[PDB]
Amino acid sequence: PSIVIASAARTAVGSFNGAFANTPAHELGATVISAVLERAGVAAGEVNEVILGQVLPAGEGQNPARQAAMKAGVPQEATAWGMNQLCGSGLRAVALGMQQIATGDASIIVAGGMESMSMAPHCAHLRGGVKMGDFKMIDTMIKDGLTDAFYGYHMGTTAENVAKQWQLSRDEQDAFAVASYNKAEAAQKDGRFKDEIVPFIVKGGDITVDADEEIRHGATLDSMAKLRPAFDKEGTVTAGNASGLNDGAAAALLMSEAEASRRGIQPLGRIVSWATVGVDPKVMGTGPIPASRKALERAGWKIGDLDLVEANEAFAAQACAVNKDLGWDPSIVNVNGGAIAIGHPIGASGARILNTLLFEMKRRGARKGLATLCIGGGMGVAMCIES
Amino acid sequence: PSIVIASAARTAVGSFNGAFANTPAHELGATVISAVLERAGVAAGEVNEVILGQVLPAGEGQNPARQAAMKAGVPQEATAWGMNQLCGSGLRAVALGMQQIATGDASIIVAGGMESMSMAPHCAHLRGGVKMGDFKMIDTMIKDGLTDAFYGYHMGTTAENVAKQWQLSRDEQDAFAVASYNKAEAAQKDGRFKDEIVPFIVKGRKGDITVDADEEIRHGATLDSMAKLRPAFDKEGTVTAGNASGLNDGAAAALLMSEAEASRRGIQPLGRIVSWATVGVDPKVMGTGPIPASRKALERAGWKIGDLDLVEANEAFAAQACAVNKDLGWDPSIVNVNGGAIAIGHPIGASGARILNTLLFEMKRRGARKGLATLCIGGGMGVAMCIES
Amino acid sequence: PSIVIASAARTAVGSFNGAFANTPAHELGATVISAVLERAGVAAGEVNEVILGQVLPAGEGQNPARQAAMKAGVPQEATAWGMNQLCGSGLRAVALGMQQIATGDASIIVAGGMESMSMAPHCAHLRGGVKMGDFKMIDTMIKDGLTDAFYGYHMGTTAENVAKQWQLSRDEQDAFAVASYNKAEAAQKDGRFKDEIVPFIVKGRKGDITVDADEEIRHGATLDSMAKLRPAFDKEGTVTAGNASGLNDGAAAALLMSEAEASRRGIQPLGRIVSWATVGVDPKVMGTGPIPASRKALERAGWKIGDLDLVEANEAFAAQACAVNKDLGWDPSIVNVNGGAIAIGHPIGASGARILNTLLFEMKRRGARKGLATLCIGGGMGVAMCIESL
Amino acid sequence: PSIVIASAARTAVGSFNGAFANTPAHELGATVISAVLERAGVAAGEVNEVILGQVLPAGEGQNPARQAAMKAGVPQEATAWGMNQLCGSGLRAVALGMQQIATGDASIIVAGGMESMSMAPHCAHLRGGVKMGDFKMIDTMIKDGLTDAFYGYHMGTTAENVAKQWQLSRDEQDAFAVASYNKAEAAQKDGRFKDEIVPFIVKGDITVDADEEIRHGATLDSMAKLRPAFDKEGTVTAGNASGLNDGAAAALLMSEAEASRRGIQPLGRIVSWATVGVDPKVMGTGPIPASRKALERAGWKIGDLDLVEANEAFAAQACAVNKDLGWDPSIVNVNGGAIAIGHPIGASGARILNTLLFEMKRRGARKGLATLCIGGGMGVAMCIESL
Numbered sequence A: 001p002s003i004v005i006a007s008a009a010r011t012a013v014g015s016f017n018g019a020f021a022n023t024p025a026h027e028l029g030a031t032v033i034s035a036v037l038e039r040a041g042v043a044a045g046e047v048n049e050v051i052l053g054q055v056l057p058a059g060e061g062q063n064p065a066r067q068a069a070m071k072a073g074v075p076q077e078a079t080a081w082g083m084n085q086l087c088g089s090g091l092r093a094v095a096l097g098m099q100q101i102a103t104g105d106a107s108i109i110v111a112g113g114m115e116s117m118s119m120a121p122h123c124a125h126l127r128g129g130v131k132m133g134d135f136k137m138i139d140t141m142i143k144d145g146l147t148d149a150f151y152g153y154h155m156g157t158t159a160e161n162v163a164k165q166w167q168l169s170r171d172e173q174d175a176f177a178v179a180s181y182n183k184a185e186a187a188q189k190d191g192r193f194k195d196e197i198v199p200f201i202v203k204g205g206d207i208t209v210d211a212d213e214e215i216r217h218g219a220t221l222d223s224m225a226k227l228r229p230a231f232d233k234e235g236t237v238t239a240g241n242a243s244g245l246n247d248g249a250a251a252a253l254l255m256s257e258a259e260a261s262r263r264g265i266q267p268l269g270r271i272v273s274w275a276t277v278g279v280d281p282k283v284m285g286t287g288p289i290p291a292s293r294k295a296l297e298r299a300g301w302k303i304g305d306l307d308l309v310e311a312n313e314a315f316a317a318q319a320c321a322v323n324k325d326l327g328w329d330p331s332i333v334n335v336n337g338g339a340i341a342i343g344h345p346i347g348a349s350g351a352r353i354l355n356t357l358l359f360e361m362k363r364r365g366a367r368k369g370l371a372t373l374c375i376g377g378g379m380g381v382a383m384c385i386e387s
Numbered sequence B: 001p002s003i004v005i006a007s008a009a010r011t012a013v014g015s016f017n018g019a020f021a022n023t024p025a026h027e028l029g030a031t032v033i034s035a036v037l038e039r040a041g042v043a044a045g046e047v048n049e050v051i052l053g054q055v056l057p058a059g060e061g062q063n064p065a066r067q068a069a070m071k072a073g074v075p076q077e078a079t080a081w082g083m084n085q086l087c088g089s090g091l092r093a094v095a096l097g098m099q100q101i102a103t104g105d106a107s108i109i110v111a112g113g114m115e116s117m118s119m120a121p122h123c124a125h126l127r128g129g130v131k132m133g134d135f136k137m138i139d140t141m142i143k144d145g146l147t148d149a150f151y152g153y154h155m156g157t158t159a160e161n162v163a164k165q166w167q168l169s170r171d172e173q174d175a176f177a178v179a180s181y182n183k184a185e186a187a188q189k190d191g192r193f194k195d196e197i198v199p200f201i202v203k204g205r206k207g208d209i210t211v212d213a214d215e216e217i218r219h220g221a222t223l224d225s226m227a228k229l230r231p232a233f234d235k236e237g238t239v240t241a242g243n244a245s246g247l248n249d250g251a252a253a254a255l256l257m258s259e260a261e262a263s264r265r266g267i268q269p270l271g272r273i274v275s276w277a278t279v280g281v282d283p284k285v286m287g288t289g290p291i292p293a294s295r296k297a298l299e300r301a302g303w304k305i306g307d308l309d310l311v312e313a314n315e316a317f318a319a320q321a322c323a324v325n326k327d328l329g330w331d332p333s334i335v336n337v338n339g340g341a342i343a344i345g346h347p348i349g350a351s352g353a354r355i356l357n358t359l360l361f362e363m364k365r366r367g368a369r370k371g372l373a374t375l376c377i378g379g380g381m382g383v384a385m386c387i388e389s
Numbered sequence C: 001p002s003i004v005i006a007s008a009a010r011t012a013v014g015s016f017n018g019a020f021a022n023t024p025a026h027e028l029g030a031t032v033i034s035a036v037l038e039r040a041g042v043a044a045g046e047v048n049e050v051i052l053g054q055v056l057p058a059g060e061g062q063n064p065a066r067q068a069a070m071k072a073g074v075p076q077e078a079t080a081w082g083m084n085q086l087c088g089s090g091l092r093a094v095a096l097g098m099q100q101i102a103t104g105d106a107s108i109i110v111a112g113g114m115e116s117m118s119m120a121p122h123c124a125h126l127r128g129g130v131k132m133g134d135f136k137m138i139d140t141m142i143k144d145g146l147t148d149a150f151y152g153y154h155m156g157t158t159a160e161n162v163a164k165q166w167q168l169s170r171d172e173q174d175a176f177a178v179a180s181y182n183k184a185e186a187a188q189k190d191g192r193f194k195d196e197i198v199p200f201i202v203k204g205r206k207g208d209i210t211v212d213a214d215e216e217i218r219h220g221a222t223l224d225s226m227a228k229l230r231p232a233f234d235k236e237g238t239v240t241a242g243n244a245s246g247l248n249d250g251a252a253a254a255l256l257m258s259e260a261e262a263s264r265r266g267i268q269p270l271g272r273i274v275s276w277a278t279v280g281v282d283p284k285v286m287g288t289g290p291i292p293a294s295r296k297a298l299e300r301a302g303w304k305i306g307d308l309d310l311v312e313a314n315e316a317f318a319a320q321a322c323a324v325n326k327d328l329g330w331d332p333s334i335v336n337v338n339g340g341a342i343a344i345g346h347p348i349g350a351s352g353a354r355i356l357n358t359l360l361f362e363m364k365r366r367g368a369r370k371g372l373a374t375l376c377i378g379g380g381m382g383v384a385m386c387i388e389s390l
Numbered sequence D: 001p002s003i004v005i006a007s008a009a010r011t012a013v014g015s016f017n018g019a020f021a022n023t024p025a026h027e028l029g030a031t032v033i034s035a036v037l038e039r040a041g042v043a044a045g046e047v048n049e050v051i052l053g054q055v056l057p058a059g060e061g062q063n064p065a066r067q068a069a070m071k072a073g074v075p076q077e078a079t080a081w082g083m084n085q086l087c088g089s090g091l092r093a094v095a096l097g098m099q100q101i102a103t104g105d106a107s108i109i110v111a112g113g114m115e116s117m118s119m120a121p122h123c124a125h126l127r128g129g130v131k132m133g134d135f136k137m138i139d140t141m142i143k144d145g146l147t148d149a150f151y152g153y154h155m156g157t158t159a160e161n162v163a164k165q166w167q168l169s170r171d172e173q174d175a176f177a178v179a180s181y182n183k184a185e186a187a188q189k190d191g192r193f194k195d196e197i198v199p200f201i202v203k204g205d206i207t208v209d210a211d212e213e214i215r216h217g218a219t220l221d222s223m224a225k226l227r228p229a230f231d232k233e234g235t236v237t238a239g240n241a242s243g244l245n246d247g248a249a250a251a252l253l254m255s256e257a258e259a260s261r262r263g264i265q266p267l268g269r270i271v272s273w274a275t276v277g278v279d280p281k282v283m284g285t286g287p288i289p290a291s292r293k294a295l296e297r298a299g300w301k302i303g304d305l306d307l308v309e310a311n312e313a314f315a316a317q318a319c320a321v322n323k324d325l326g327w328d329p330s331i332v333n334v335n336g337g338a339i340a341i342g343h344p345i346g347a348s349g350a351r352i353l354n355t356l357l358f359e360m361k362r363r364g365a366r367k368g369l370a371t372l373c374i375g376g377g378m379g380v381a382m383c384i385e386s387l
């Protein structure tokens, strides 16, 4: 039961109300679905199932994963469904597609994630009727994506809990963000994102989007320190050291190692192990810590065996706590930047960092890799990759 | 790897804006999660993951499956997530939880579905701003749950295509519906739903109300009143409110573990999962989805259609249900012996686990050895699972 | 010039989300407009202008007063318009229609008010767009009708201000409310509302329903159940849902013409408008508006308070109504003889003309010569009108 | 009783979602109320009543006329109320305030209109509850301000009916619109709007003292390239029709004897007024019978008029009005009209009264006439004589 990633692709990460301001998530998803089939030389008729993670599907219609699969050219014989583990949806969907082939219930799976947070609507329950008084139109992006359902405050407040408990100062979080911007800004000019990015044509004059628009040029430590806190009047999490609201999609083509050998495909890597563990919702940013340990234990690897690490940077506070506890070399963690600079599409972030992990391992010849993210509500997910 | 269903439970199916009119889906889910743990003698601290299918989670908060697990008593160390394959979500989640234990990544899984379509809100994209003119507040239940995203018409229109293609008259669909109502009315009086139903406490402010009976079951469904109804989707069609399933709320789940685990704990499971399958079809005739799904599930299990002792085929529409029983050709006396969704109700996210609950307890109640549960899915898909006692 | 009220009519006052839950205000207005023409023997083609007070017209369309006139049969040559002085709109519209005839710019006026508080929609400004976060859908009835724009609290809080300054206890307000219910229930049983009420046919989906009785009047209002209610505006206050007027729908109007015109047509008018007045007060105690308005009206008419034979003072709240009767000092036995808005209902835009209808028909049945109608107005205003019989 | 206009003032007319995009109507009204008081030397404590026409007050609060009076300094002893006769509201309020003094029920009146069409909200009746299906959020500006309640189509459709019956071609309407822009742009450059306009401070603070709808260099070629805005094969376009605008205007009314006792030189004497209704299909023909009734009530002939202000709701309705009555077009809208200046529904009636009054004093005209059309099939006119 050896499962490999034959190919992977992702769209550029768009800013909130930016290039993808009016593009539904399934429009970004099918472009990625068509890319992983074209990059692997596999026809759409051979896909058995499409598994796309999505957190904000309100208003898009019946099963947006089916719409993305039908629009990419996957025939009606295949099936499609969506799943939601918040920020780990994109990565958990890859593990779920791996289990479909491992149990012998499928041969070729397209798994990933898609998210259009700009298209997230405002909602309100109006069936019972409002007899008298004002009622609130709730932002589904904030309520169903960014607000803890057990304590009522934003994910940024949970990052404040991580910063206060781990004793991470404002200057330590800002320096981590600037380092993420500098690595991401360098990677874009050097063209290290060109392989993983598939261009998306926004048919409006038509506009082709093939570059992450969240990268701001010349991020200075001085401009980072002038920002006001966004969640606590005297807090430490700001707009600079926290991930933003973004749109995008990413996916991967899954098949057995024997199947890839029969088709002459050179896969990006083999999925050797995965894990998901839950933590206290107050400190949801610490999720990747027990998940990465469980994944490495299942793979038989030590922390020193890792050659490349992709840890999602939801917040600068949560990212500092993860790298210090596990103790892995920070020079191999997010070599090309993180979500603070690239963007954070919730449903697609799991597959987004998997794309960056896969293409960078082949680019520099890394043998062992690990991708992990934190999940709102107090959870984590991790996956071990071997080239 | 042999995976068994150690226990199962479901809430009563409530009417649209009825007893559960103001109850969130995760509150119905938490009751079922606690029930399957109590009925199997398994503590909440041993659950590894909770998998709940849900189609309409807008406005309920971050990951309602996590909320249902935390409120049911499952500790924070465990994980939870939701999935969406429309009407087959409740049953696919059970197959997904079965795969978690088969691959050795988990030991005990709570899988099922929950749906509160009464709590489904109206929405509208307003970030760009409406400079001038009227805009529509869209019903998320209709848009994301009941409308085909490729052709724009309701699921009832796909049933009209099935009825015309299979040449099913208005009288044949009404006769199937009346049979479904009468079987459900008999099952309710005989108490055949008491074992599977777990009572839900509607915690109100002017008195608590206990719900332990499906309120959609209509007493004395007559063929004359069935023929008096108007078509609901085509001005000259055949599908009416009587021969079609309704809008409902409810939750259902099952406790999954290996056969060795149940033997170590002295647990007597309700059944072993022998096979499952999911196939896609044309969205125009999505009601024919269960036909190739049942064929692949039986083919994967090594069974023939004649080997089945009990059959649970979800009755999304009377037209779609008649075409399935006619194609496969199994004995209709073993299909939905206690009624179907036409009489009980059709909570989209929870229907897959709902009919699995009725299949499991009825197989135990009458000593059936082999069973099959199957549903159709909007967009042109089907899902099926074969159960052996 | 001498302007008289040739005829008057009003619909039954409907409960909030009751019989008129889905009937637009102009549908109730058209019924009343047709009634005052039939009761006076005046054809619709003779009306020069229709003046209808309305406070909550959002969502009803372009100028609902014009819609009510066109549906009642008033030809397109005539004009129609709406005005808004809150709770005094129905009565101010009559004074405004009288001025149209006084200045010689019109001959026959249909003036009154209409209100459908059940049909008042929720609204929100969405042109700029909500980039991120929740926004509020505002109840237009609460915001534009029942909330003071200067202090932000409900009209019921202004009644609490009146109760504190006049030292009106909960027991006195409850006793005033129970007395209002018993007078209204007695008047309804005796049929004293039949003349003023015109039946309204609720064109529904499963058959037409005729409404000809005020449905807010509850039979057998007890002081014990009144005292068990909780305060509705202050957690430790005195104004409750029982001693305060409710949310209601309805319409009322009158046909105005000169005394010489009515004499030429052989019409016996209901009364002569002798004087009117409107004065403003502090918005904190808006319920005291009728005190300076009634005095200014009596001064303009040359009357003293003792000359009045009948008084119709709108009962917005039990606190404001008790403070008005104590200041002016008129005999309470001649004030609201058939009950008030606490029992009948308070459709804001139409209440001014509603109590004018009750004053006019009660003056004719008992032979009263001098009458006065007055109401309080949100924001700190009052309006009053003096009527003399013919 | 002879009633005069002691003073008049108006704000600059703002574009839809322009300088007044977030300014409530009563904020514009208070500025105008304070202006007419200062220009006449009359204190706010002397005002008896404020009468402001307003058509779209949804969401602004209880009686916006009272809010404008309280903020302008008018004491609580005075009264205030709003009225609604659509487009003729601003001018009818002046006639109503004139009647208050004629009957001896008031001495000093501030009458006019105010409108903030940008602040008009979307609404929907939700008390009964929407059990199932989609419902519409209704634009109160379109529904309660611009849509005929008897035939269901826009006011621009009624102008199409006017154009067909009088046989007014597209070229004639475009030439009328361009002429209106050129007259308004010339008057602005020469400063003929400076006297009537009171500057408004949009609280960086921004001072607005110029009508922002006036476009410099309006060409006939770009006018003819525009598409019809109400009928796919119609003749009314965005260029030959008035727009959606915000603004306020008012006037100070008192008896001629009162002004003489105060040493005030009035802008004019109100000699007559009239309002007549017409068929709602051709509501633009309202000024035709209304102006005749006003002239008949004043004892004047059409040839006696020295200056005319006829609101330009549409180029089609304005051409039909000038042709029927037959007055000299060289004395009609000498400084431009609503096609170039703007058309704030509640304030347009008083807006053209301001333009008529200051232009009559500027050139020494003795007799004037202001008139507008009203949705639903009505018209209003007023005759002014200088003193």
Ligand SMILES: CC(C)(COP(=O)(O)OP(=O)(O)OC[C@H]1O[C@@H](n2cnc3c(N)ncnc32)[C@H](O)[C@@H]1OP(=O)(O)O)[C@@H](O)C(=O)NCCC(=O)NCCS
Pocket (backbone or CB within 6 Å): A087, A145, A146, A155, A156, A219, A220, A223, A224, A227, A230, A238, A239, A240, A241, A242, A243, A244, A245, A314, A344, A376, C132
């Ligand atoms: C930033 C956030 C908190 C919302 O605040 P926001 O108003 O939308 O942020 P904006 O970009 O619109 O404005 C931020 C300001 O800081 C400035 N700024 C932001 N990042 C900066 C940087 N890195 N360097 C310098 N300046 C910066 C922006 O230009 C902007 O300027 P302004 O003061 O004129 O507005 C949003 O990113 C957020 O909600 N993040 C949560 C992500 C999350 O929780 N994901 C869940 C996974 S746990």
Ligand SMILES: CC(C)(COP(=O)(O)OP(=O)(O)OC[C@H]1O[C@@H](n2cnc3c(N)ncnc32)[C@H](O)[C@@H]1OP(=O)(O)O)[C@@H](O)C(=O)NCCC(=O)NCCS
Pocket (backbone or CB within 6 Å): B087, B145, B146, B155, B156, B218, B221, B222, B225, B226, B229, B232, B240, B241, B242, B243, B244, B245, B246, B247, B316, B317, B346, B377, B378
């Ligand atoms: C069919 C549907 C439109 C029904 O609409 P509905 O009008 O709200 O259904 P209701 O029962 O509330 O109203 C139906 C009317 O017929 C009556 N009626 C319905 N079923 C009846 C029956 N079986 N016997 C007798 N009378 C019946 C009802 O009492 C009601 O009375 P009314 O005429 O006074 O209104 C809706 O339930 C539906 O869309 N179902 C399919 C949803 C779906 O897609 N499910 C998943 C399949 S993929």
Ligand SMILES: CC(C)(COP(=O)(O)OP(=O)(O)OC[C@H]1O[C@@H](n2cnc3c(N)ncnc32)[C@H](O)[C@@H]1OP(=O)(O)O)[C@@H](O)C(=O)NCCC(=O)NCCS
Pocket (backbone or CB within 6 Å): C087, C146, C155, C156, C218, C221, C222, C225, C226, C229, C232, C240, C241, C242, C243, C244, C245, C246, C247, C316, C346, C348, C377, C378
């Ligand atoms: C006072 C007010 C807030 C009440 O809100 P409400 O929810 O509609 O009050 P309700 O009538 O629906 O219910 C009140 C309760 O008291 C009871 N009650 C009301 N009046 C009663 C009476 N006269 N005697 C005995 N019991 C009474 C009702 O039955 C109800 O009990 P329930 O809830 O168990 O059924 C509302 O009527 C209001 O806003 N009034 C303002 C009037 C106003 O401002 N007018 C403008 C003039 S300035």
Ligand SMILES: CC(C)(COP(=O)(O)OP(=O)(O)OC[C@H]1O[C@@H](n2cnc3c(N)ncnc32)[C@H](O)[C@@H]1OP(=O)(O)O)[C@@H](O)C(=O)NCCC(=O)NCCS
Pocket (backbone or CB within 6 Å): D087, D146, D155, D156, D215, D218, D219, D222, D223, D226, D229, D237, D238, D239, D240, D241, D242, D243, D244, D313, D343, D373, D374, D375
């Ligand atoms: C006609 C109306 C719909 C305007 O159309 P609109 O949707 O607002 O579109 P716009 O106003 O932004 O103008 C549209 C285009 O015409 C162009 N245009 C407008 N006026 C122009 C002019 N005078 N000369 C040349 N070009 C012009 C604009 O630049 C714009 O070009 P763009 O689309 O590339 O940005 C609106 O102004 C209206 O309804 N007016 C009627 C008001 C009314 O009836 N009041 C009641 C009277 S009784």
